[PDB]
Amino acid sequence: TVASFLGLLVFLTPIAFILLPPILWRDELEPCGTICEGLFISMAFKLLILLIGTWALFFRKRRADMPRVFVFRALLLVLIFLFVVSYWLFYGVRILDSRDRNYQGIVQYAVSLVDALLFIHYLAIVLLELRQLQPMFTLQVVRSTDGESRFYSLGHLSIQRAALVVLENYYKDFTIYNPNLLTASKFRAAKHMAGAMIAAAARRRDSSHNELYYEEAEHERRVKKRKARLVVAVEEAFIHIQRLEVMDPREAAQAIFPSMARALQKYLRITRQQNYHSMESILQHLAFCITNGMTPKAFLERYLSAGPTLQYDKDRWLSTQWRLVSDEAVTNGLRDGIVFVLKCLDFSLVVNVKKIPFIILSEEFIDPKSHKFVLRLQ
Amino acid sequence: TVASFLGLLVFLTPIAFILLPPILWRDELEPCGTICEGLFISMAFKLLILLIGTWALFFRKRRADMPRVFVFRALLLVLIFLFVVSYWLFYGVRILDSRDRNYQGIVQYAVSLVDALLFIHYLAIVLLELRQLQPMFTLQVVRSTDGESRFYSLGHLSIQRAALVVLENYYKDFTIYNPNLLTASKFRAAKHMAGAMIAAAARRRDSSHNELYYEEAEHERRVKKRKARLVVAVEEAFIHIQRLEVMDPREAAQAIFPSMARALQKYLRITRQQNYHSMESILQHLAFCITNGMTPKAFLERYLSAGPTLQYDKDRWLSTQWRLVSDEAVTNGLRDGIVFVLKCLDFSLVVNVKKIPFIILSEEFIDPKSHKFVLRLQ
Amino acid sequence: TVASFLGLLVFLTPIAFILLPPILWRDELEPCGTICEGLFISMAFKLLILLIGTWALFFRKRRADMPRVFVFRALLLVLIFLFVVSYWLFYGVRILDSRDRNYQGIVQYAVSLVDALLFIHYLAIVLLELRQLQPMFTLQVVRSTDGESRFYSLGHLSIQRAALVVLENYYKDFTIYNPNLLTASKFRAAKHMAGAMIAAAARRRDSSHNELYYEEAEHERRVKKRKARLVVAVEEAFIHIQRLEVMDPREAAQAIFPSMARALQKYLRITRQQNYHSMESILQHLAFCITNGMTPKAFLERYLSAGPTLQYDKDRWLSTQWRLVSDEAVTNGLRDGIVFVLKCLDFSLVVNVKKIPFIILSEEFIDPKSHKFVLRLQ
């Protein structure tokens, strides 16, 4: 490919610096003998180390699209470019155009290339994944809709890369965005829209009958009742088949699903999760749990709670529609007190960054003989 | 030991390459003088760096037994073996059998050995702990019995090493396997075993009296009552002794334990945790909390909830009885959509792996002047 | 500064070793030509790598004050000191006092300095952040007051640095210390202080009327009622302004705050959080949520639950008043079974360390053809 051809060029540059003097001026080489060959062996082993490490840490697909340029990868690519161009420039001007003797020094030049390219690989692992290992900052990530909030520690990242780690943790950690869980507050605010003084109106409101407390208690009671119906239905559904007419787990799932289908439908409607689980999805997860020997409760934990975003179908999450709002340049590093917002189509992740505080530890000595207790009351 | 003797050989190989030419042919050395000694100093400092780093990252006990071979450690050991054997081969064939001059080049050969062995140490830290730093995958780990589920991010690991990290997080994160919390569903399914049409039977079931809702509400009420009794008992037990007859925390624990013992026994029976806490364990934790100045609630948090597996006795967890079920080779790396199962004696951890999605970020500019609000209703 | 001047000296040491032979004895240099210049280029590129990596990982402020000396940073500074002093000593004794020829060897000496100083940078990243990447231990951190407990995995750290990571996770993860949530147990124990036999007294206590169960149920009911009042108040407060008299979010916050202020005050009093939120803090967070387009529930999640310590004001947490109690030297590494206590002014973090167990994995083969199921009951 494009980067693979440049990788082939940067890998064959020391090999070309070795091979060209015995080809272009074969009879002009000084007799090296031992030291040149013992340096070729070190060259080959260091190139093997470089190829294995480059495969291990950089033969992987691009993980994300960021708004501005990855500053550290641009720095590494500019450094590799100026590195290899300066070595080819010195090799063409001061070695090939002069047709040098002392081939041992040419092999030393190629081995210094391999050494400094290994240190470029080391600077790459320093910049790309070791600079943010030490947790310099904390990040409070809050959804703007339901208020679900988790805290994360991050090192020195840019606002781009911090937003990337926040979105990774969003798909892993936050429950999935459900707009149907949000409509009750919207209709309640619109019902207030249907109809000094602002403190007296609040006093008349707080003295009135709280419909919301009793409706939430009654809804929680209905959810517990539908949950108990669902648990009984899924237990008496799983008891209908045996691990051993012979059938595969898909047909066993289709066999036992009509004895749980109505209770699950009523539970997903009362918990407002019915848009998240098609019948095909439930049958695939049912055959999955029947295959792996999972209990009714282990099958049912997918449906009892909300669950994170990566449980669900790949279209229900949408990672290409993320927008990064920031008051400053997103290539700037994190610092104390900045706010950046990760906007999806309906919700947003409001992220404010706080510096992890300077902590002062001190010892104090507790004598283990000073742990004496008396039967007297305290 | 076995690996320690090979470590002594790989550490003494550059030193032997240095020491053998002034011993075997002492009068044949060309006068090096400055450059050889300034290269010995660099050799000694790089060997000190190599010894300190090798102690820091590899002088540690083997952490786990895996089914197949650790592929990266086997690659590193084969690389070290071919490395050192090729250097001894070139040193015996082309240096010792020829009895070379230009000892400066021999010291350069030994320093190139020390350099490439430092880069072997670097390739070791690349392969063993840096390749999986960037979180390529997410892992949904579910117990097959109670359905408890947590999500974890992992990089490029094999299925072996991913299963190892999953088990680390199992002992840290999941509540302990309690088979007594699972018997109610089993007896309920056996009670259904005591006694078109499959949809009508489900309709008659869901219209019947849900015993399960009222039994769960009544059990939760009994657990709250026993919890309140236990809190009162442990508070009035801790008030009987004073931090200051003089006694150590073991005898103070034995003094105040009979005023809390029955309430704790009834709470551990109602929460089905009585097999997990012997009287010796409770007395040791009681003397522990009396020693460290912990409150009754801080003592009691060990017993109120289930708690993770590493709270409990070392025989109650059993890390040697883990079985890895996978449809493919466990030395293969993680990829999107694979399922592997970690089976203990009674339960299993069903782990399905999902690729963390390709995320596209973009900026959008919000003018901070565009945050103007009106008192008008919305 | 102090460390910046020593950094300038260690950076200019190879440059000084290069520049001094053409200045002090200019006419005595042997003609190097190609190889010396091709080694200067490698020197300049490796010094650029060293400067970029040193900026990336070590140009950062000191994060914490520890009781005893950081052992690994002291080892690194002693190593750099003996390193650079030994190189200046050999350069003064055996190069400057002799006024050497073969300047190519002097450039090789300076390049070996730059190489071994890059490996010092590598040993620094090995000791300071790579030795603890592999999770050797688990840590149960419990507050002595309310018993809140979380488990953390750590590698080979000292007790100092483990305590530092524990405090990082304390400010991120534990809910904030609230002494007002603890006074009910203290007054209940003092009420027991107002008034064989120790088992009969416990039997008479556990048979009595449990005031605590009914008071906790009644308090939870009052908290749910005040929460419903607060949700209604904040929704009907946010509906009073529109995103668009024109006003900024501070004045919009001040406009809509008197219609929610009494319900929020009553909720913070019933949940004992009123010392944590001044009116200025609530108005700043209100203007913050009005700015970022957050819902009433997203505004309200700061106040509904306790929340971690870093949500609150910077004086409410106090990172300078931490005391480390340990039975051994805090520079010793973690091992299985040690207990260290992190004491704040009122509470303490009791941390006991357990070794993560030796896990034995094995394969077992499940035939995917062996997943056959029958319609027969099990």
Swiss-Prot record, chains A, B, C:
Effect of residue 263 to S: In NTD; uncertain significance
Keyword Glycoprotein on entry: no
Positions on the Cytoplasmic side per record topology: 60-69, 131-378
Superkingdom assignment: Eukaryota
Gene Ontology biological-process annotations: mucociliary clearance; pigmentation; Wnt signaling pathway, planar cell polarity pathway
GO cellular component, one term: lateral plasma membrane
Membrane-crossing residue ranges in chain numbering: 5-25, 39-59, 70-90, 110-130
Annotated compartments: Cell membrane
Membrane topology recorded in Swiss-Prot or TrEMBL: Multi-pass membrane protein
Membrane topology, Extracellular segments: 26-38, 91-109
The entry's keywords: Cell membrane, Disease variant, Membrane, Phosphoprotein, Transmembrane, Transmembrane helix
Tissue-wise expression: According to PubMed:11956595, ubiquitously expressed. According to PubMed:12011995, expressed specifically in testis and ovary.
Disease: Neural tube defects: Congenital malformations of the central nervous system and adjacent structures related to defective neural tube closure during the first trimester of pregnancy. Failure of neural tube closure can occur at any level of the embryonic axis. Common NTD forms include anencephaly, myelomeningocele and spina bifida, which result from the failure of fusion in the cranial and spinal region of the neural tube. NTDs have a multifactorial etiology encompassing both genetic and environmental components. Sacral defect with anterior meningocele: Form of caudal dysgenesis. It is present at birth and becomes symptomatic later in life, usually because of obstructive labor in females, chronic constipation, or meningitis. Inheritance is autosomal dominant.
Assembly mode: Heterodimer with VANGL2. Interacts through its C-terminal region with the N-terminal half of DVL1, DVL2 and DVL3. The PDZ domain of DVL1, DVL2 and DVL3 is required for the interaction.
Protein name (Swiss-Prot/TrEMBL): Vang-like protein 1
Residues of the full protein shown: 114 to 519 of 524
